[PDB]
Amino acid sequence: TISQAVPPVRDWPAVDLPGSDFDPVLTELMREGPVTRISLPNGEGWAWLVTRHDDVRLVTNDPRFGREAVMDRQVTRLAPHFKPARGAVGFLDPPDHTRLRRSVAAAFTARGVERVRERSRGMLDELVDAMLRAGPPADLTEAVLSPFPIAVICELMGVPATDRHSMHTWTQLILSSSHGAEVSERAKNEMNAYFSDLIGLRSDSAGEDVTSLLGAAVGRDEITLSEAVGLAVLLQIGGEAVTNNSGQMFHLLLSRPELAERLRSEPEIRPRAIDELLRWIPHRNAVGLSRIALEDVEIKGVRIRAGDAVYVSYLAANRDPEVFPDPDRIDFERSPNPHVSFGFGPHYCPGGMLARLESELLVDAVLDRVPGLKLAVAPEDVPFKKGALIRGPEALPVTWHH
Numbered sequence: 001t002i003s004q005a006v007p008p009v010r011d012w013p014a015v016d017l018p019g020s021d022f023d024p025v026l027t028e029l030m031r032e033g034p035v036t037r038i039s040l041p042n043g044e045g046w047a048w049l050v051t052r053h054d055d056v057r058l059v060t061n062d063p064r065f066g067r068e069a070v071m072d073r074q075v076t077r078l079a080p081h082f083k084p085a086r087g088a089v090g091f092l093d094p095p096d097h098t099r100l101r102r103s104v105a106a107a108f109t110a111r112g113v114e115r116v117r118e119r120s121r122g123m124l125d126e127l128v129d130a131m132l133r134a135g136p137p138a139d140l141t142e143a144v145l146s147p148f149p150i151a152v153i154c155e156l157m158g159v160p161a162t163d164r165h166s167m168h169t170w171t172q173l174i175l176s177s178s179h180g181a182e183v184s185e186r187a188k189n190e191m192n193a194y195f196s197d198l199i200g201l202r203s204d205s206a207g208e209d210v211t212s213l214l215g216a217a218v219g220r221d222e223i224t225l226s227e228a229v230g231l232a233v234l235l236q237i238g239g240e241a242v243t244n245n246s247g248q249m250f251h252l253l254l255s256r257p258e259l260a261e262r263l264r265s266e267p268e269i270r271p272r273a274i275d276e277l278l279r280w281i282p283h284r285n286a287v288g289l290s291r292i293a294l295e296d297v298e299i300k301g302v303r304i305r306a307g308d309a310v311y312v313s314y315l316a317a318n319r320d321p322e323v324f325p326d327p328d329r330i331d332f333e334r335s336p337n338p339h340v341s342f343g344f345g346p347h348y349c350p351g352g353m354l355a356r357l358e359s360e361l362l363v364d365a366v367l368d369r370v371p372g373l374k375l376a377v378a379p380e381d382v383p384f385k386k387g388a389l390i391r392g393p394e395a396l397p398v399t400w401h402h
């Protein structure tokens with residue numbers, strides 16, 4: 001009856017934000033309305049953006065939106081390079097996405113990840129033992145936050161003991177180090193070859209570890225060898241997300257002492273506190289991967305045309321004032337806490353339960369075993385990743401009583 005003008009296209013340039021400060025451009029978009037249009041540094045054109053919790057759930061869970069179609073054109077994006085392997089789990093839709101996620105689902109459920117809690121707790125104590133032995137001045141990221149997620153994933157994946165040192169090295173080299181491309185690509189190839197072999201050997205394995213599950217799914221013609229290897233690599237190197245995120249957790253726990261004090265005073269609230277931290281921490285820069293409207297869809301009186309690219313902001317959704325009253329307040333007691341830090345819909349993060357487990361063990365060890373733990377520099381002096389997709393510290397210098 002009455003025309004509702006489409007929103008203006010908002011430019012969203014890459015900006016390095018300090019520590020855990022919220023993106024002011026995202027804030028502006030959140031205040032403009034539930035549905036906006038954005039233009040990112042890379043790719044071409046514009047894309048719709050939804051920021052409200054309900055809209056984010058709709059776009060990420062509804063069959064009317066697809067991921068596969070995304071690789072048909074250069075959708076405006078943040079990352080400089082795009083158009084990777086299609087077999088990538090992120091670019092697959094139900095006709096094949098389900099087969100891949102189903103293959104390893106059991107190992108990533110709450111009970112699945114509990115299988116490695118004891119071993120992981122032990123490995124963490126070894127890392128902390130070493131840091132304490134070395135003495136007071138340390139980079140918590142290098143000494144703990146970085147190696148721990150890798151050690152835990154090796155155990156969950158079922159990587160032979162004598163091959164884990166290689167996994168560590170490959171992971172570090174992969175998409176994050178010197179001799180860009182060359183070294184990174186080389187390590188990526190070695191890891192691919194490794195998992196290609198391990199999984200193949202597990203063709204008829206009944207093991208519960210991830211590679212065994214992958215090998216069996218392959219053996220049963222549920223997924224191809226290529227599909228299994230690709231996912232295995234992604235899962236193997238996905239721990240960096242925990243390294244970065246937990247990095248923000250401790251930066252927060254140390255810069256806002258009241259938070260650390262509460263967790264030491266009431267250990268029982270740690271699980272819920274971790275979830276609150278996960279909801280609050282601005283995990284990434286801008287937005288990640290869009291979805292293409294497969295047919296026309298209306299959102300808050302806005303007509304999203306079939307073919308249009310649509311982005312969701314999980315960070316904004318986690319600050320939805322209706323769902324999270326006083327959204328900017330870090331409240332460990334926040335009763336209902338339906339955050340989407342681990343995404344939503346078919347593509348929700350498989351590592352979510354694992355990330356919570358790793359975060360819980362980390363908080364325990366760091367807050368209970370480091371006497372007088374505090375930042376060794378001013379909070380604003382902690383270096384954070386620049387030109388990154390996933391936010392977090394480059395290092396987290398801490399000190400304590402020897």
Ligand code: HEM
Pocket residue numbers: 060089090091101234235236237238239240241242245278283289314341342343344346347348349350351352354355
């Ligand atoms: C606190 C740490 C983590 C956070 C905040 C996080 C967050 C996310 C988010 C927001 C997505 C996108 C969902 C979407 O496409 O709508 C995702 C996808 C994914 N994450 Fe994580 N993640 C974390 C840790 C991990 C870990 C440790 C692993 C490896 C076990 C992992 C593996 C994956 C994979 C494989 C996907 C793609 C899933 C698919 O598209 O089917 N994540 N994650």
